[PDB]
């Protein structure tokens, strides 16, 4: 049987080099890195190199932290809740600015925060499917503790003006967090250029395992623990380290940046092929802008078919995809593992499935 | 070279059957279980069986939850912080009772909670190295939201009277949490017998991977998310599921209970051998009670040697162990993988190392 994975914005496959690098730490290198003996110290080089890859991948500096967490969602809840106690309860800066495009990890936590009495303003989405930096400018008040905008939308795949917002925030003295999970491995990421205080990522979106991610914390910025017990990760996030995954995610990030050119030049080419070969069906449009997008994502609506339906049908022919808010539209999410063969086949099976669904309509 | 691992209360080695069961989900079964297509649905049976093993392992009932978390420390911070908003801020029950023996995941979070204005009373440890259930009884007030006592001490390895406290709490209407990480795989665990509302475990203490654990939540007991974003785990803990680890931890727990008899009957026998063959050195005593202990742990002090020292020396001869509060004492932590050969050797190298350190003293 031959299947086609186009659900990469949902999760990706672990690169074999990632699997390989991790295996030893699930076999004999199973010491706890906190221990003082050989079983624990023996794991330090591996860990250190993995971390090196992470720092290097996002151009964090030695004086910054990249804290290992259990996933981006941990990262997000941590920034929001920590800024809550630090900035909102303790310094009275009881406002947060974010967007409506933000992953439920951000919005939902915000929802809880307003439940506690924070006022959060969710920036509305424009015609262009984007946000503009001036848009937060006329929302930052003396009460704003934090602005949080995602680096790229998980649904449409379009990049936001992170540098702009970075500059705004630098200027007006408000903490900046970017949820960058959709950015890693897809477009260059630079916390320095972004003037970010906080950045989130999750490994399984760039060919590492599910169940680990990271939060970048900028030098001398404080953030009260979400995991108290303060021994590991410079006391900012306690719990025995996930050695195998840490080593894997480090390799994963290395490979991701190493394939940044490929991502734009062929995965992007393939994405454009799927897209413009695909819009040759009647009555179909891509949801939002096609310029300021991540190379691997296309979100298409077909006029007179609910997104899900097309998904179920496509599944039957061994091709995986997801939905996305526009009724609902369908999201196709490529990766470095897809072939031209595969998307030719996709154009075929998609058009076929579309026209069949449309005419049994009557 | 041949090494001897006796640091099992710090972390354990993954059972090979655990490694084996997990491998497929790091290779081709890499779908995201939330997805609707074949890549996601294909993982449901595996997950469901893994969860079945967890429920079965702790005698949770179908109407209870066992929520996958990223480790026990997550579990602990979650119970404490959630009970904080639910019971303390919202119902005015601004007291918690716990012990001083509790892992830093519990105590440290408590420390933060008193920073916010909760009053926490840490029960003191007796002569017997234990706690008595009547001890919490004369500390539970109209303000008590929660009592938290660990099922077994990570340092001495001694069991606490969980049933007693369970009954007390049932009676007096206060939420009960037990951090059971040291109990799993070591002594029978029964949330029902324990009348627990909440129970924590971490897989890497019973031969699963580091970086996953669980929180048992009793039917109709509420607990506000620590991970908001409310999609996975019946909206109680959001973030893409850690498939490989979930499957592994399930196998891990199955094997742990399956070896409960062995644990008491041979690992315990080996532990007793190390212990009574070991106390034949002058000036040495085991820290606390030797009756109400987990089968695999011995914590010994040597009179006139700081624990660490003995640790460094023992490391040089390829034998791993840890310290523990009494100066400091040394903790030897066995598992189902240790052999009689190994502990004979240990008695040898320990006595040798002890007498050498003692006489270069002069
Ligand atoms: C009772 C107990 N609770 C919580 C933890 C924290 O576990 P985690 O969240 O999986 O990191 C440990 C680990 N105990 C020890 C870990 O290292 N040395 C120990 O004695 C523990 O023994
Ligand atoms: C931007 C962004 N933030 C956070 C998350 C949460 O990641 P986690 O903590 O690793 O589970 C996702 C995952 N995005 C999607 C996950 O599933 N479908 C998606 O579109 C994401 O795309």
Residue with tokens 């063959």: B277
With beta carbons under 8 A apart, name residues in chain B contacting A39. 3, 5, 7, 320
- The answer to whether B238 and B228 have CB atoms below 8 angstroms apart is yes
| Chain B residues in contact with A19 (beta carbon < 8 A) | 26-27
Write the CA distances from B210 to A257, B73, B249, B303, B346, integer angstroms. Answer: 27, 12, 10, 35, 27
- For tokens 């009756």, name the residue: B291
**Contact at CB, B11 and A19, closer than 8 angstroms:** no
User: Could you give the angle at which helices A104-116 and A72-83 cross, rounded to 10 degrees?
Assistant: 30
In angstroms, the CA A265 to CA A296 distance is 11
Chain A nearest-CA distance from B123, in A, is 18
> Are A342 and A4 contacting, i.e. CB atoms less than 8 angstroms apart?
yes
Asked if A129 contacts A290 with a C-beta cutoff of 8 angstroms, the reply is no
Q: What are phi and psi of B7, to 5 degrees?
A: -125, 40
CB A215 within 8 Å of CB A66 = yes
> Reduced to 3 states, what is the DSSP secondary structure of residue A242?
coil
Q: How far apart are CA B123 and CA B106, in angstroms?
A: 13
| Three-class HEC string of chain B | CCCEECECCCCCCCCHHHHHHHHHHHCCCCCCCCCCCHHHHCCHHHHHHHHHHHHHHHCCCCCCEEEEECCHHHHHHHHHHHHHHHHHHCCCCCEEEEECCCCHHHHHHHHHHHHHCCEEEEECCCCCCCCCHHHHHCCCCCCEEEEECCCECCCCCEECCHHHHHHHHHHHCCEEEEECCCCCCCCCCCCCCCCCCEEEEEHHHCCCCCCCEEEEECCCCCCCCCECCCCCCCCCECCCCCHHHHHHHHHHHHHHHHCHHHHHHHHHHHHHHHHHHHCCCCCEEECCCCCCECCCEEEEEECCCCHHHHHHHHHHCCEECEEEECCEEEEEECCCCCCHHHHHHHHHHHHHHHHHHHHCCC
Structure tokens given for B153? 């001490």
Q: How far is B127 from chain A (nearest CA, A)?
A: 27
Q: Which residues of B touch A229 (CB under 8 A)?
A: 73, 76-77, 103-106, 108-109
Count the Cβ atoms, other than its own, within 10 Å of residue A278.
20
Q: Please give, rounded to a whole number of angstroms, the shortest distance from the CA of B171 to a CA of chain A.
A: 31
Give me the residues paired with residue B119 across strands.
B95
CA distance B122 to B107: 8
Q: Alpha carbon of A184 to those of A6, A61, A211, A266, B59: distances in Å?
A: 18, 17, 16, 17, 42
- Candidates A223, A227, A180; CA nearest to A200 is A180
Q: Which of A37, A240, A312 sits opposite B204 (nearest CB)?
A: A240
Measured from the Cα of B239, ligand 2's closest atom is: 11
**Measured torsion, CA atoms of residues A350, A355, A359, A361, in degrees rounded to the nearest 10:** 40
Q: How far is CA A220 from CA A64, A65, A197, A214, A217, in A?
A: 8, 10, 10, 18, 8
What's the resolution in A?
2.9
Q: Which residues line ligand 2 (CB under 6 A)?
A: A 9-10, 71-73, 103, 105, 150, 154, 179, 181-182, 202, 204, 213; B 32, 34, 239-240
Strand, coil or helix: A121: strand
Cβ–ligand 1 contact at B9 (below 6 Å): yes
What is the distance between the alpha carbons of residues B187 and B237, in angstroms, rounded to a whole number? Answer: 28
CB pair distance less than 8 Å for A31 and B320: yes
Ligand 1, atom 19, residue with closest C-alpha? B10
Per the rule left: phi > 0, alpha: psi between -120 and 50, beta: everything else, A283 is left
CB of B105 closer than 6 A to ligand 1?
A: yes
State both tokens at B325: 């509060």
- The two structure tokens encoding residue B307: 């624990």
Integer distance in angstroms from the first to the last C-alpha of chain B?
A: 33
Instruction: Report the distance separating Cα A108 and Cα A102, nearest Å.
Output: 9
Render A52-109 in DSSP notation, one character per residue.
HHHHHHHT--TTSEEEEES-HHHHHHHHHHHHIIIIIITT---EEEEESSS-HHHHHH
Report how far residue A244's alpha carbon sits from residue A211's, in angstroms, rounded to the nearest whole number.
Answer: 11
What H or E segment, with its residue span, contains residue A325? strand A322-325
Structure-block tokens of residue A311:
């998904």
Taking CB atoms and an 8 Å limit, are B226 and A226 in contact across chains?
yes
Q: How far is CA B43 from CA A16, B22, B28, B35, B212, in A?
A: 20, 12, 11, 10, 18
- Residue A211 Ramachandran class (φ > 0 left, ψ -120 to 50 alpha, else beta): left
Beta partners for residue A178, in sequence order: A199
* Residues B329 and B303 sit within 8 Å (Cβ to Cβ): no
Chain B residues close to A33, C-beta within 8 Å: none
- Best to test chain B binding among A18, A22, A26 (most B CBs inside 10 Å): A26
CATH fold of A15-259 reads 3.40.640
C-alpha–C-alpha distance, residues A227 and A249, integer Å: 20
C-alpha A102 chain-centroid distance = 10
Q: What six digits make up the tokens of B339?
A: 């052999």
Q: Find out whether A344 and A278 touch, Cβ atoms under 8 Å.
A: no
Entry field: residues in chain A: 362
How many residues are present in chain B?
362
Question: What ranges in chain A are assigned the alpha helix state H?
Answer: 16-26, 38-41, 44-58, 72-83, 104-116, 133-137, 162-172, 243-258, 260-262, 268-278, 307-316, 340-359
Q: Would you say B182 is a known binding-site residue?
A: yes
A144 membership: H or E segment, kind and range: strand A144-148
Asked if B227 lies within 8 A of A10 by C-beta distance, the reply is: no
**Alpha carbon distance B239, B225 (integer Å):** 12
Residues of B in contact with A108 (CB under 8 A): 228-230, 238
In our burial notation (b when 16+ CB lie closer than 10 A, e otherwise), range B213-235 reads bbbbbbeeeebbbbbbbbebbee
For residue A293, give the DSSP letter: B
Listed in order, the ranges of chain A carrying CATH 3.40.640.10 are 15-259
DSSP secondary structure code for residue A204 in this structure: G
B104's CB contacts (< 8 A; 6+ apart) are A229, A230, A231, A238
Please report the DSSP string for A254-292 in residue order.
HHHHHTHHHIIIIIHHHHHHHHHHHTTSTTEEESS-SSS
**Structure tokens that stand for A132 in this block:** 């503009």
Q: Give the SS3 label for residue A3.
A: coil
- Whether ligand 1 lies within 6 angstroms of the CB of A240 is answered as yes
Yes or no: say if B236 and B217 are a contact pair by the CB < 8 Å rule.
yes
């Amino acid at each position: 049987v031959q299947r086609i994975y186009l659900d990469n914005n949902a999760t990706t496959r672990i690169d074999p080099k990632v699997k390989e690098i991790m295996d030893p730490f699930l076999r004999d290198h199973y010491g706890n890195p906190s221990s003082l003996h050989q079983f624990g110290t023996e794991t330090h080089p591996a860990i250190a190199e993995a971390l090196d890859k992470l720092y290097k991948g996002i151009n964090a500096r030695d004086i910054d932290d990249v804290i290992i967490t259990s996933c981006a969602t941990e990262s997000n809840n941590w920034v929001l809740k920590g800024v809550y106690f630090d900035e909102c309860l303790k310094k009275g800066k009881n406002h947060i600015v974010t967007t409506v495009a933000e992953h439920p990890a951000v919005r939902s936590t915000c929802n809880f925060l307003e439940s506690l009495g924070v006022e959060v303003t969710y920036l509305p989405i424009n015609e262009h499917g984007s946000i503009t930096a001036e848009q937060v400018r006329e929302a930052i008040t003396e009460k704003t503790a934090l602005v949080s905008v995602m680096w790229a939308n998980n649904e449409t795949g379009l990049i936001f003006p992170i540098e702009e917002i970075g500059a705004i925030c630098k200027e007006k003295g408000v903490l900046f967090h970017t949820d960058a999970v959709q950015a890693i491995g897809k477009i260059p990421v630079d916390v320095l250029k972004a003037n970010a205080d906080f950045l989130s990522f999750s490994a399984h979106k760039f060919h590492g395992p599910k169940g680990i991610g990271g939060l970048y914390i900028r030098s001398g910025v404080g953030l009260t623990p979400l995991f108290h017990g303060g021994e590991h990760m410079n006391g900012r996030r306690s719990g025995t380290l996930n050695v195998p995954y840490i080593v894997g995610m480090g390799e994963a990030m290395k490979l991701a940046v190493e394939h940044l050119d490929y991502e734009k030049e062929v995965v992007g080419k393939l994405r454009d092929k799927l897209e413009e070969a695909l819009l040759k069906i009647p009555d179909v449009m891509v949801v939002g802008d096609r310029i300021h997008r991540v190379p691997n994502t296309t979100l298409v609506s077909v006029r007179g078919i609910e997104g899900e339906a097309m998904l179920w049908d496509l599944n039957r022919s061994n091709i995986a995809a997801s939905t996305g808010s526009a009724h609902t539209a369908i999201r196709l999410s490529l990766s470095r593992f897809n072939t031209e063969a595969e998307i030719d086949k996709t154009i075929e099976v998609f058009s076929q499935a579309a026209v069949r669904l449309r005419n049994i309509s009557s």
